Amino acid sequence: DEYDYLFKVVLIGDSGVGKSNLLSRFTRNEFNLESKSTIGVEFATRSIQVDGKTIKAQIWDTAGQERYRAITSAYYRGAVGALLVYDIAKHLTYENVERWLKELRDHADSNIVIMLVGNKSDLRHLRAVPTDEARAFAEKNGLSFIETSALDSTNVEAAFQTILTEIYRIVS
Amino acid sequence: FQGMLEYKKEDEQKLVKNLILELKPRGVAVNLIPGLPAYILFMCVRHADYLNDDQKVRSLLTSTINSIKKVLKKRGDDFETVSFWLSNTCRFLHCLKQYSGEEGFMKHNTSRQNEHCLTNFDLAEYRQVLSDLAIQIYQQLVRVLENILQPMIVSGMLEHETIQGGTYTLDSILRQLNSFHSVMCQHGMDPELIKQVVKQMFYIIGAITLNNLLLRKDMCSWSKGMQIRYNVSQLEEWLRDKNLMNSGAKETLEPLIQAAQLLQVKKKTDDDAEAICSMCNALTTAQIVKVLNLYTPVNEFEERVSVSFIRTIQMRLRDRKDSPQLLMDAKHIFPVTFPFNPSSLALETIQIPASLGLGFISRV
Ligand SMILES: Nc1nc2c(ncn2[C@@H]2O[C@H](COP(=O)(O)OP(=O)(O)O)[C@@H](O)[C@H]2O)c(=O)[nH]1
Ligand code: BEF
Ligand SMILES: [Mg+2]
């Protein structure tokens, strides 16, 4: 297949927030209730259309764990986009967003496009992170914002579509 | 029309020559519908059976099998040739079963198709000959594709670095795979056969890549592990795009995947050891220990795998009862199972184009 742009996008956030299922939902429309902690680094691609151009998303995935700095550097290297993910039903994962933002600033290009993603929006009855609170943090820190559900697929396409479009605005 | 084909006894060699010996796979009339030579051949058998001519039945079937063997002996190293005649031999076998007159092979037949069944001859023995012939053709197909893929694997799967963001690359392998698959599809090869061929190709890719890991220290780092995992992910996505996720091809890569994972994971604590043992169930103890031994870091702040850690691994993998295998047999061929795929094609509707050069054949 052919493409006009190749955008490396990385997924970051606490273990269990749903990074790998966001990947699987977007790239192959699949979801796993029993997905286990990601081993090493995983990869998946999908091409979309932006402004009449074919943009190939190259999505990197890894566990929200501590690792050798060199591996982290390789993970972020060349990334033009990042999904910073937390669990709307787990406030601790939202509290740790600052930590992942710090890792981002330490390793990523200064012009990387960052979207704050509140995943598991299907768990409405268990919400621990107010939408307004997270959106306000995102806006304050120069991040895009969206709430997704990898489970029922809500806003998953829109999330990737938006961040890939914002990257395109910068690099085209 | 009856759905048979009549030919003079003096034109039998002429029949097998144009339809089998000198027939081109890329023929325009041949690419209208798949298995056309197989259908034409069988339509002649029906007439022989209808004529109760046991001598003609014997000669034609003998001329057919020997003509197919001849093409594959002459044009032996051509993928398209082998692929084409594997498809047509199987279809010729399909016809002999579908129109055998045996109830077990006529469950999907129409009323008119049953009227086309053989009435005078039991060709059960001849079907066995073709079945064994089909096995030999498939064997030959695998050898040809293996000879093409083998030189590309090491360079494309390991040596060519792209994870940081002429000789063969991953795209080279991907393109070759596409060519193989496209050819088999064009010939209308049985889907069960195509899937088994793809599985065979992926095993070859996996085994050769994994064997090089187990033989080279300059390939055992976390960076190479990431590269290998990405390369495999590309192969997986190719499978998905071609609707081959049930071919078994992906599962053959599982030892390679776990080796790539082993290169990436932590290798120090007892928890790391337990994680490795639980993770590498598709690798043997010898293979796991080997990779840990060959693990040669390329950065400063990271140490080599200690002897204490390796002992811990061997201790945990003591109670496992697995194969003693170290290097894999990259030449191994999985035993092929052949399907029986009868078609809805109406023999009485099949016409013979003039470009085939078979005008001497009368349509009965
Ligand atoms: N209810 C719900 N559960 C989810 C969603 N996304 C992921 N999960 C579950 O959360 C668990 C962790 O998912 P995973 O993708 O492996 O988290 P990761 O460590 O960030 O990759 C899994 O059991 C998933 O089934 C979602 O949108 N809604
Ligand atoms: F555990 Be997840 F993969 F971060
Ligand atoms: Mg994960």
Numbering used by the authors:
A (entry chain A): 6 to 177
B (entry chain B): 1471 to 1635, 1655 to 1853
Passage from the reporting paper:
Direct interaction between the membrane anchored active Rab11 small GTPase and MyoV (MyoVa and MyoVb) globular tail domain (GTD) is necessary to target the motor to Rab11 vesicles. To gain insights into the relationship between Spir, MyoV and Rab11, we solved the crystal structure of Rab11a bound to the MyoVa-GTD. This structure confirms that Rab11a binds to the MyoVa-GTD SD-2, as previously reported for the MyoVb:Rab11a complex structure and indicates that some structural variability in Rab11a occurs upon its binding to the MyoV isoforms. The structures of MyoVa:Spir-GTBM and MyoVa:Rab11a demonstrate that the Rab11 and Spir binding sites are on opposite ends of the elongated MyoV-GTD while the GTD adopts a similar conformation in the two binary complexes. This implies that the two MyoV partners can bind to the GTD at the same time, as shown in a model of the tripartite complex. The Spir-2-GTBM (purple) binds to the SD-1 of the MyoVa-GTD (orange) and Rab11a (green, Switch-1 blue, Switch-2 red) binds to its SD-2. The MyoV motor domain and Rab11 compete for binding to the GTD since the surfaces involved in these interactions are in part overlapping (namely the H11- H12 loop). This explains why the membrane-anchored Rab11 GTPase alone is not sufficient to target the cytosolic inhibited MyoV to Rab11 positive vesicles in vivo. GST-pulldown experiments with recombinant proteins using GST-Spir-2-GTBM-SB-FYVE also confirm that MyoV serves as a linker between Spir and Rab11.
